[PDB]
């Protein structure tokens, strides 16, 4: 003698993929109430898998969309594809930049189509290609690939934290296990509406300005046995790294059309030295020791670090951006096994960059007048394991990049999106 | 206490379900689409509730007897040693049948009330 009874508001969820609101402080992310609220879920064990999470694809798409929307209205640099006459710079008026900066004279279109103006600019050698084997004939790197658009002066390059908030009828489960490795059961789970603030920082070899592991170093990978899968190493103690460019640039403008203004480097005012990043040797030694000890738990061989095997400038050197300058730093003093005192790493600056492969085609970053000085925290390392032969007594790990999703999987590994199903049917004595 | 009774037995979870019910410029396309989808889902659930005569109720009682082939567990076992997720997983194959039975019962009730008030 039992009858059906209908309950609305049953705590039952199912795995689902949806679009999530973007909060801060065609495409727009401007809600201003990121005030979090957390509810623990007692006696609930939930399965997590960070490598099958749609939040990373959503973040990829959102960052690409924001980048494209920012560069929509400002200057196109199609006249710059002109044959350049480049000679050695005259800077007479650890190392100097006389071998990296070239003084290029060319012709450009004025705001009247009938007259051309002969102008000059200082370009970095990484942004120029030589047309003839022995000659002074030079062109830009991107003229055979795409059309470049100037980074508009009002664009700010610093990251802003982004919160992801599930719409009504959904929830974000958060795994609070302090030694979580991204896959498996979680016995201490909480529920939230908006994730914690995540900064879309772009880097290649060392993860910067991120969160720290609560207890110990975490090694994460989709498949350890597959040497083609990158390894994310999340540290519990950040290492301070300070990068500077001591050269004093001059931001000078040329009117290249009816309202189109092109900014360039006139001359190097003084302090002729290469850009460099400073790091503390002892802290890096301790961090590397801890990483090696943690990795001994997964590989039963001696662990050594070697520099990247090869490739171009993009896939070999530590790329990052700050103040609006785009640095490529040579991390060979690190990842090579006195480490006393201060480690100084040389860096080179690039202006024509392609931050996202196939997105935005390319961007021209205008120079900044003053001396650039910048600080950051290393909170993670991306590594790649060289394919062994089964005979070597040691495994070689090299700092390597890859997809930029890895820069965000390290921040969204403890989140899951679920769909509420609030309609239950139960037998009860009522009628 | 949103979803706070997930790990609790249905005997205690059924108390104060209204927490879940309460929780249940230029805009982007995705934001507008999400809002419209949420409205549609709420309206669909309300349509199902209204079909059975449970329009504005959280704990709604019906007139369809419980068939033992749907689930033969004891009342104490159901309401004392299981959660909502496990129970809903167990009876997943009969939800569509029970929905149709509830709709038919409500229609029969309405027609019978009409006939009785005709007399």
């Amino acid at each position: 003698n039992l009858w059906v009874t209908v309950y609305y508001g049953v705590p039952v969820w199912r795995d689902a993929d949806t679009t999530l609101f973007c909060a801060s402080d065609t495409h727009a992310c401007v809600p201003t109430d990121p005030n979090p609220q957390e509810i623990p879920l007692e006696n609930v064990t939930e399965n997590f898998n960070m490598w099958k999470n749609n939040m990373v694809e959503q973040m990829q798409e959102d960052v690409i969309s924001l980048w494209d929307q920012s560069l929509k209205p400002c200057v196109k640099l199609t006249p710059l594809c002109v044959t350049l006459n480049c000679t050695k710079a005259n800077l007479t008026h650890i190392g100097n930049i006389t071998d990296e900066v070239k003084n290029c004279t060319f012709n450009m279109t004025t705001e009247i189509r009938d007259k051309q103006q002969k102008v000059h600019a200082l370009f970095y050698a990484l942004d120029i290609v030589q047309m003839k084997e022995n000659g002074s004939e030079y062109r830009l790197i991107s003229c055979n690939t795409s059309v470049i658009k100037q980074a508009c002066p009002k664009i700010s390059f610093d990251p802003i934290p982004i919160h992801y908030c599930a719409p009504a009828g959904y929830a974000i489960l958060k795994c609070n296990d302090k030694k979580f490795n991204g896959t498996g059961p979680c016995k201490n789970v909480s529920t939230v509406q908006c994730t914690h603030g995540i900064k879309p920082v772009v880097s290649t070899q060392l993860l910067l300005n991120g969160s720290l592991a609560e207890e110990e170093i975490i090694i994460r990978s989709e498949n350890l046995t597959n040497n083609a899968k990158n390894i994310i190493v999340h540290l519990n103690k950040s290492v301070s790294i300070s990068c500077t460019r001591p050269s004093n640039n001059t931001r000078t403008s040329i009117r290249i059309g009816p309202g189109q203004m092109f900014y360039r480097t006139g001359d190097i005012i003084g302090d002729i030295r290469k850009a460099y990043c400073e790091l503390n040797g002892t802290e890096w030694n301790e961090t590397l020791n801890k990483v090696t000890e943690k990795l001994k738990e997964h590989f039963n061989k001696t662990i050594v670090f070697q520099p990247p095997s090869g490739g171009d400038l993009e896939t070999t050197m530590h790329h990052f951006n700050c103040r609006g300058e785009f640095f490529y730093c040579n991390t060979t003093k690190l990842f090579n096994t006195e480490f006393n005192g201060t480690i100084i790493l040389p860096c080179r600056i690039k202006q024509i960059v392609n931050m996202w492969q196939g997105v935005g085609q390319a961007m021209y970053a205008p120079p900044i007048s003053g001396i650039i000085n910048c600080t950051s925290n290393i909170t993670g390392i991306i590594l790649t394991r060289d394919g062994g032969n089964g005979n070597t007594t040691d495994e070689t790990f090299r700092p390597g990049g890859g997809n930029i999703k890895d820069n965000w999987r390290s921040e969204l590994y403890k989140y899951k999106v679920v769909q509420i199903e609030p309609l239950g049917i139960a037998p009860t004595r009522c009628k | 206490g949103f979803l706070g009774a997930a790990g609790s037995t249905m005997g205690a979870a059924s108390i104060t379900l209204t927490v879940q019910a309460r929780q249940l410029t230029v805009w982007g396309i995705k934001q507008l689409q999400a809002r419209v989808l949420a409205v549609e889902r709420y309206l669909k659930d309300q349509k199902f509730l209204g079909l059975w005569g449970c329009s504005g109720k959280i704990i709604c009682c019906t007139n369809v007897p419980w068939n033992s082939t749907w689930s033969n567990k004891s009342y104490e076992e159901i309401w004392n040693n299981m959660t909502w997720i496990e129970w809903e997983k167990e009876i997943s194959n009969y939800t569509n049948r029970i929905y149709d039975l509830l709709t038919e019962s409500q229609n029969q009730q309405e027609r019978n009330e009409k006939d009785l008030l005709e007399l």
Epitope: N47, N49, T183, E222 | -
Partner: antibody, heavy 130, light 106 residues
Framework: QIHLVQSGTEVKKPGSSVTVSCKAY?????????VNWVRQAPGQSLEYIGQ??????????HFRGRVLISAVDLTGSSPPISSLEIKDLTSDDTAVYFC??????????????????????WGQGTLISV | DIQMTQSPSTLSASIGDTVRISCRAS???????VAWYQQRPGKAPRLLIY???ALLGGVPSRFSGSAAGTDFTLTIGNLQAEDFGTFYC?????????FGQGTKVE
């Protein structure tokens, strides 16, 4: 692409103990996959021996105290491993032992019911003669 | 401790026929917690049906299942050569799981 590879045939004497291994190619981790060990006597039906699930090991009543089940997760050189240890063998234990894995990631899936499970993938089986 | 029995211990058929196999349980399983397996001689058994009437990836659409209380049925239509050997029947509603005695086809 779940391939389960098991050890070879072994011939033993009563009173001894045996160990059977199972390498799970394609299984990302045992935190999402449950491992079940079953028995098949020659000419009879399948019998369930034990399981490891969420790093908890269990055996049936007929085998408690004489079967020990262990497992280790993905390492740098080998896939996930599971292993049976059988103590105090008798003439009735001669059979083919099977290692099986079933996914547990989807909580709503019909392949498992609160620990007692179906067996989606099967190994080639090890023949043990005593 | 549910014990399941299969009635047609031995069967015979020709290519293109249709075969029905039945399992009876000592208790009603209202959750349809029944699985159907196939085993060819000298090979590991293969799982074909779970939840009474659900197919797997790669299993042909010819196989079908029905579940009702204590009676479960496996139906094979347009029988081919590959569908030979011993068919097994398992429950996983209670602990421990239990298998059937198997039915020989072909």
């Amino acid at each position: 692409q779940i391939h389960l590879v098991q050890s070879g045939t072994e011939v033993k004497k009563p009173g001894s103990s045996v160990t059977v291994s199972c390498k799970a190619y394609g299984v990302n981790t045992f935190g999402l996959y449950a491992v079940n060990w079953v028995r098949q006597a020659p000419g009879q039906s399948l019998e369930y021996i034990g399981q490891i699930w969420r790093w908890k090991s269990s055996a049936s009543h007929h085998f408690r105290g004489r079967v020990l089940i262990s497992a280790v997760d993905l390492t740098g050189s080998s896939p996930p491993i599971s292993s049976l240890e059988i103590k105090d063998l008798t003439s009735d234990d001669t059979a083919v032992y099977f290692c099986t894995t079933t996914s547990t990631y989807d909580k709503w899936s019909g392949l498992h019911h609160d620990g007692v499970m179906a067996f989606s993938s099967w190994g080639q089986g090890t023949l043990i003669s005593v | 401790d549910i014990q399941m029995t299969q009635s047609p211990s031995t069967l015979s058929a020709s290519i293109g026929d249709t075969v029905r196999i039945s399992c009876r349980a000592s208790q009603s399983i209202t959750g349809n917690w029944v699985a159907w397996y196939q085993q060819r001689p000298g090979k590991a058994p293969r799982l074909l049906i779970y939840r009474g009437a659900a197919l797997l990836g790669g299993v042909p659409s010819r196989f079908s299942g029905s579940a009702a209380g204590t009676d479960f049925t496996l139906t094979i239509g347009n029988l081919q050569a590959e569908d030979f050997g011993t068919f097994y029947c398992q429950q996983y509603d209670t602990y421990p799981g239990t298998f059937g005695q198997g039915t020989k086809v072909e």
